[PDB]
Amino acid sequence: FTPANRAYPYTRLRRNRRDDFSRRLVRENVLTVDDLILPVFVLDGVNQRESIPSMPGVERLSIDQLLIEAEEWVALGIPALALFPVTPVEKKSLDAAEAYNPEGIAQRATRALRERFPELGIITDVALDPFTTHGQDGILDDDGYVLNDVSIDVLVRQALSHAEAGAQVVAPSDMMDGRIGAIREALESAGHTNVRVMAYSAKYASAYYGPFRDAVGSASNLGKGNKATYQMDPANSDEALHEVAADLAEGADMVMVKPGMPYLDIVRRVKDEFRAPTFVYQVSGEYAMHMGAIQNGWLAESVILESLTAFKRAGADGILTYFAKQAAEQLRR
Amino acid sequence: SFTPANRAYPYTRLRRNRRDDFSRRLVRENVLTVDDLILPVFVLDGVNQRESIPSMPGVERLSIDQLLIEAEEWVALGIPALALFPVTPVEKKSLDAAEAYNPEGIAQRATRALRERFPELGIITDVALDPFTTHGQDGILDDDGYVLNDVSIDVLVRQALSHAEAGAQVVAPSDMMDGRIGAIREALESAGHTNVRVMAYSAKYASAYYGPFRDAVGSASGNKATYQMDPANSDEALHEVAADLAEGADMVMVKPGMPYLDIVRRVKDEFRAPTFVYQVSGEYAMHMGAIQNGWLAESVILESLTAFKRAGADGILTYFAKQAAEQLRR
Amino acid sequence: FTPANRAYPYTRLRRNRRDDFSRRLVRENVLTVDDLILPVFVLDGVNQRESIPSMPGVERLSIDQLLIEAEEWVALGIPALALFPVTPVEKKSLDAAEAYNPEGIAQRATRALRERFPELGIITDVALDPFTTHGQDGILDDDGYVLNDVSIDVLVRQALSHAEAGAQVVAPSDMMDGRIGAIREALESAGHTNVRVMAYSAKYASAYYGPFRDAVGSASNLGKGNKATYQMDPANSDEALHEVAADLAEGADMVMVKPGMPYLDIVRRVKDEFRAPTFVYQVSGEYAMHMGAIQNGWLAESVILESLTAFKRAGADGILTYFAKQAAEQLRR
Amino acid sequence: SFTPANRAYPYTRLRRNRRDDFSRRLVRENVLTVDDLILPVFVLDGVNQRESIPSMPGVERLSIDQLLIEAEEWVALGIPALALFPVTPVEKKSLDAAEAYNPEGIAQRATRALRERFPELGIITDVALDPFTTHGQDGILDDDGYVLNDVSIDVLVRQALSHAEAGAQVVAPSDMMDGRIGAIREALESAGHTNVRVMAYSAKYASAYYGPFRDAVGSASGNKATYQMDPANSDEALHEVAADLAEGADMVMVKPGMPYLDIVRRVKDEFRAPTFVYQVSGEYAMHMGAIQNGWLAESVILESLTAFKRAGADGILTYFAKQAAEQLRR
Amino acid sequence: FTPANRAYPYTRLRRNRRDDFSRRLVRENVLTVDDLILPVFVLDGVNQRESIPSMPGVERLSIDQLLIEAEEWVALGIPALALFPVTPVEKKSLDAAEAYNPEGIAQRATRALRERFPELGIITDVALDPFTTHGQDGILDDDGYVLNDVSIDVLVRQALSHAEAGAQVVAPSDMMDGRIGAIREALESAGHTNVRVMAYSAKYASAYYGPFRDAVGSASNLGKGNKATYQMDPANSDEALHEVAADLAEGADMVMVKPGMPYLDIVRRVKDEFRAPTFVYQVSGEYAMHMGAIQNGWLAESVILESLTAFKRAGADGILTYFAKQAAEQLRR
Amino acid sequence: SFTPANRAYPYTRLRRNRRDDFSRRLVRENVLTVDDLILPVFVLDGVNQRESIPSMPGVERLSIDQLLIEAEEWVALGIPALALFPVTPVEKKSLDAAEAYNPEGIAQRATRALRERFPELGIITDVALDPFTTHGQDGILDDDGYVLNDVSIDVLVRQALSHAEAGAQVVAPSDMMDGRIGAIREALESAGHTNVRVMAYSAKYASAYYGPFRDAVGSASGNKATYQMDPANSDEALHEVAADLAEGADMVMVKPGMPYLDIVRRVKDEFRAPTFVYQVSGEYAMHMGAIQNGWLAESVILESLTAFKRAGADGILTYFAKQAAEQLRR
Ligand SMILES: [Cl-]
Ligand SMILES: [Cl-]
Ligand SMILES: [Cl-]
Ligand SMILES: [Cl-]
Ligand SMILES: [Cl-]
Ligand SMILES: [Cl-]
Ligand SMILES: [K+]
Ligand SMILES: [K+]
Ligand SMILES: [K+]
Ligand SMILES: [K+]
Ligand SMILES: [K+]
Ligand SMILES: [K+]
Ligand SMILES: [Mg+2]
Ligand SMILES: [Mg+2]
Ligand SMILES: [Mg+2]
Ligand SMILES: [Mg+2]
Ligand SMILES: [Mg+2]
Ligand SMILES: [Mg+2]
Structure with a gap:
């Protein structure tokens, strides 16, 4: 950057701050509804609405209730939803077969939303954590380690069942190496040419996922387990560039x-x-x-x-946020 | 800066994001909002006057009362600022451009009237001598017909001060004299006009595109290649901006x-x-x-206005500002 | 960039502007005839010259009339023409078969110009919009979407018929993903080693194409249709770099x-x-x-x-411009 | 800057380094240590006083004797510095903010007491007028309610000098007046306070996140968008820092x-x-x-504190500093 | 870099140096035990401890003695050891077959340490210099030149025997072209998915290896021979970037x-x-x-x-150092 | 900056250039020559004296006549410059370091003797107070034992002037006082010493590696972390050099x-x-x-000296300079 020799009092940076009009003129970034993705927790059954104690104001919703709420999400102009199914306990398994069930919640919710709201973007989640008895995002070996390439086999079947249900976007959150290119290849092979892959590229082994794990019901499955062998170390920045570079090379449409x-x-x-x-x-x-x-x-x-403007300023094009309705409403007015 | 990341068809198909409105909106890199808009306005001397301009279809010169009336609609649309360009009566032009710093010149009157009735509306005055000289040249001429640099700056400074006294939040020197931004900033600071912004016309080309404006303001009675920039030059614009920033401009x-x-x-x-x-x-x-x-x-x-945002502009002075502001409200 | 501490009054940038001679010495860019490409609208038949109301001073020309006009284009030193055929209404189809007709206007005009003016560069247009009943640049699926890879099959046949006619340059304007590499591959395979591909790399879904659509006669075919699923979003700049990077990788000689x-x-x-x-x-x-x-x-x-000097200053090597004769004439003098 | 080097799955599997604790530790890019920590502390006027703060669970305002007692534990943990924020009695607030430079103001007293009993502990004083004004604004107001820039700097300078006289190793101007870093540096140098560091609050946003602190210090009886930064602006923060460095800040x-x-x-x-x-x-x-x-x-x-190190911070002012320092000792 | 116009006396860089507390606040880099790798010389037999005259305080250790010393290395928190076997004279050969002996010192020491200290990182050495009668890192042709691709065949067998013994990390120090990708490929093919390759990428033909050559017992084998046909010229810096770029491309996890x-x-x-x-x-x-x-x-x-802090400051993440115990001890306190 | 250019084994084999001496010589990126060498020399007060130094095997302190004798061999080898370090007699040390600017101090005498007998040989004098203070600290101490910055600069300036008067082509301030390069340059220019080079010791770390030199010069009767650089700091060295360049250093x-x-x-x-x-x-x-x-x-x-050239040094001060110069002649 070039400071161009700017010096007080010839340069006083408060002059642009003097008035709202100059403030507005020079303001570098703005949040709009075009930046918003609403994640939603999706229940099985009919007429179900469940509060989440660790996410006040957020509800798990059955598909019928989700279709009604979506009327306003669309009216507010929110471009897309990211679906997170709340797997029944009895459907969790070692092999995570429910991930690719054409009658799984994710698949049913996609078909219903794609038919009811053809312009609304549906982003499905590609990951095994809602389906495994252990709560980890892939298949374990006999050491209890999340197998990379074996997990990708299942993730691929899942991604394909999502495309088949009509999802315009699949979002692998699993953090297996190479899964973007494997899923891309399979989608291409199967003629799903335009299904976007939204890669979770630099996804950290974070302590900030607690409430979501309660929300999807994976918390009791995971227990004290951790994801440090696949999710990224919080301390690591350069490593994020390598992650993204590979996902781009592998065909991701968004990172x-x-x-x-x-x-x-x-x-x-x-x-x-x-x-x-x-x-x-x-x-x-x-x-x-x-x-x-x-x-x-x-x-x-x-x-x-303020929290959402930070994402724009930092360089994000879109933000998956549980605040997306509140924000759209405030925008809106 | 830029890394292709080995992206290759068919793994990469740049049309996937284009497939649907929702994904085009999500990835859409820039957006024009009324926050980006400045309306330039041509201001008449009389009352109850509007005039049409043959080379500027749909643009009217307005006397100050009409300006106030119209500004109600501009303020309602959320337009942040106007840029005022006085249409000087022929009797008021001179070799010394004294009308430039007249406390009752059209720009000064318009400014006081606007600052009083719409105190949140930004007023950007024009610092230049071309509406005031008998030959309309942007400065004072020497005996070979050359636009004198430092002598013109003396008049521009008097002018900028008169605008600051009239209440203008921004003075915009469009004259392209060397060093004027610094001289104006110095004089503003010495006079205690600490918060008056200076919007430098930093890289202002010796263009053929100003023809209609010259009809608009009545300056059309000659070239400016000794002060305005050669259209061919790009590296040069960086030096012009570096100087204006160093000299204290708040916007370029x-x-x-x-x-x-x-x-x-x-x-x-x-x-x-x-x-x-x-x-x-x-x-x-x-x-x-x-x-x-x-x-x-x-x-x-x-599309044209969107191009400005994409190219990196924060604000656009545009005669389209009202039309664009209405499309953005609808 | 390095401002090198330049300060008024030691630095006065008007000194170089003082005189024409210094102006000329430091002037950073110049337009010459070596930068000029003339696009031309080509009619079927003989002895045809048709005015275009939305492009005053521009005429559609039959091939015989085009050969006569080209005498002066060459005398003025204009390096190349870009040909745009005006397809008869009766030759428009779903499958765009006229695109690769060895007797299509584009192909006939190439053969005639290559023989008459061996040094003149002929750039053909690779795109289906002049040949489709719907006015879109490719083949539609049952949703009315422009199919990517199926369109490329037809574009490849077209490019090959252009090379076969003797075109030194083919210019795919279609904006299908991967078409540069597909056309490059086919040209190579067929021994058309030296046929240049001038990729329309960052070609925007623009409102500025109106008059041309009247000129080629595609406007009534397109109707209210748009090209936002393939032509680029006007708002997008970073995305242009990805477009160009791929076309270079795919073998484009010009972008x-x-x-x-x-x-x-x-x-x-x-x-x-x-x-x-x-x-x-x-x-x-x-x-x-x-x-x-x-x-x-x-x-x-x-x-x-002034408009043409802007292109040089901005970084262009060559400019496809309907002003190319006027400009060459003014240069010239 | 950054070269992908053609790294491609499966030759490249970024999970190999993640496989085991030992390799994660080896490649681990950043680490928080107590060297990175500054504890801000709210200081009361009395003796034997602590108060709880409803919007800041677990944080106590301490009178100076309690501060000394607690600082024994902070020093033992290896915390390098405190940042003092006085809780000004209502009787001591004024339009002129004179209490700011009172040699017996809470900040000044706390500083002398700390410098004497823990001579190796860094004391960072707050240079700002918001704990001292009746309206708590960070400067002196003019008649339209505007925070005067240069007039406020005159008071901030008197304040910074009083801190340097009290023994403070660092004064930290948090006021966001233009040019204050230079004026404070000039005055410090003229007075022979050659080694007093200035920690500029350079890019200090007009945030909603300061709410609890306003309860903590008692300033909660209004916005600061004419001096604090617009949250949307990033390029702007570079200009703010460039100026503060040129003006002589030792840390930004x-x-x-x-x-x-x-x-x-x-x-x-x-x-x-x-x-x-x-x-x-x-x-x-x-x-x-x-x-x-x-x-x-x-x-x-x-995780939050680790984020600061990764983003490029050398030091973190954090109310978590004691807790983090104990986790790093255990 | 941007100097931002900082000038004495407004900028006095001694102000931060005034006090230990400010020193500590701004201090740019720190050494920790997480940066430390201890190399160890490993003897055959039982109850063997041998001083090294050119590396005072360093001992060659039999595997039983190594297991005892490792108790404290682990207690000090040292993340990893790099093993260097001291090959018996009688086991040196032209073909270096001992390199891939499942009963070689390196392999035996790995198995023993992996079982005794499951969390300790074991880095094995991939190179033929401890196994060849000539002391060179590969197989010679009839001109006495170190054959590149033939050497890689043996290095691959070695790397595989190390993985089979349970080594989490293999570190090819040999400086053959392409050996990272050959070893990576073989490890992948054989299912050793998570075995890291720590490439000696920019390894110089240095005079500073003397004591180590005495320590591993290769000095008398090498004699007056040199490694200038494979180890890098000390004078060359740009060339190091090419070396590293290839090893990354080839799959190295560390360089x-x-x-x-x-x-x-x-x-x-x-x-x-x-x-x-x-x-x-x-x-x-x-x-x-x-x-x-x-x-x-x-x-x-x-x-x-001071010597170890230099490595952190210069950009290293980890340091193979014979000082690693002393350092960890000093850290520690 | 750096583009891998998709180089890949086996098309790329970086060992091909290493195959033969002739191709290694052709591509060899850097080469040490005697043009790169500066010999530091420890200078005694007497005549016909040499002393050995226990921590510096093979290095002798020489009285000025021995220095002249040895310099014949250094000049013959083509060594461009010496860096003189006087071994001050105990009687000549003081709190005021006055011996630093003594026109008959060892450095000054050595310089005149050298400039006269070998007029093409470069003489680099040491600007620092550590050979002259009773506590050997590089400056004057205040009452808390702190090395005073500006007061030390006053003595360093007197010293640098005395060196310029003695004929030194280069004065090299090694003291690490803030601002000294500028003060020395100013004084040199005011006194008409227009061509005297200043070789700033710009990024001079608070190192443990100076131990043997302290025995060599007799300063070994304490740390310098308040003025010499923290070994951990890299970004800091850029600021140190930027200042010394701005202040007029000819080499850093x-x-x-x-x-x-x-x-x-x-x-x-x-x-x-x-x-x-x-x-x-x-x-x-x-x-x-x-x-x-x-x-x-x-x-x-x-190998060590070659490393300096590769890392980007133009010149190396090294006690190996004679040995290296002989290997380069042979
Ligand atoms: Cl699809
Ligand atoms: Cl003002
Ligand atoms: Cl050809
Ligand atoms: Cl001080
Ligand atoms: Cl493995
Ligand atoms: Cl001189
Ligand atoms: K967006
Ligand atoms: K704006
Ligand atoms: K020229
Ligand atoms: K720190
Ligand atoms: K590390
Ligand atoms: K060479
Ligand atoms: Mg990944
Ligand atoms: Mg200018
Ligand atoms: Mg493309
Ligand atoms: Mg500031
Ligand atoms: Mg290599
Ligand atoms: Mg310095």
């Missing part, structure tokens, strides 16, 4: 940094280095922490749009 | 607009400062003419 | 940004990043808008060379 | 912290200077609230 | 610069350019030279941590 | 040498200025000790 606010520097570096469609997840713990402080009267509602 | 502008998008892009990339671009009278008329003739669909207006 | 003046920042970035032979189209709407303002007395003729 | 700070990691990263990459970040009261409370509610595991605290 | 302190500029460039896990060897001559000066009373012990 | 130096090659590399890459590196007494002794012990072959000396 994602996960967690969001605790990793904004990663967003910045990924946008700067690759100049590709860049996505960020404002995860369940980020949401819970803001919502808990707002409900306590400790922070003003306005932190919501 | 590239002029003409669309014929110079590459300059917007270099200026934003290199300096990372508030960057402005003028979509000039000639751009406006070309587009407007083609639309009215039925040659071009009217969506070319948002 | 083109289209529209021209509304996308000069793209020209700048493409030249800066790739350092490759870079081309820009000053499209029909750009031409119409300048010509309409000049005829109205609103702009001086001099905007023509 | 980004504030808020985690909602601005991208700014930490740009600031460190571009300037390669000592870079500091404040994990503000709102960050602390959000995390603390979620942990106590059972929503988040307490390892999110080290 | 190493060798010697350490005489090549810190190489460390800096490799980290800066590639942003990959970067390793550096503080070689036997570096160790001997510091230890000799410390024992003579010519340098303070404190040069040890 | 990194000290210690081999433990800081990464700093040489950053300094040359970023500033592209004449860059010097000191291979310090501790480096010399480590190498020398290992060679004599039979542990290392003597080719490690050229």
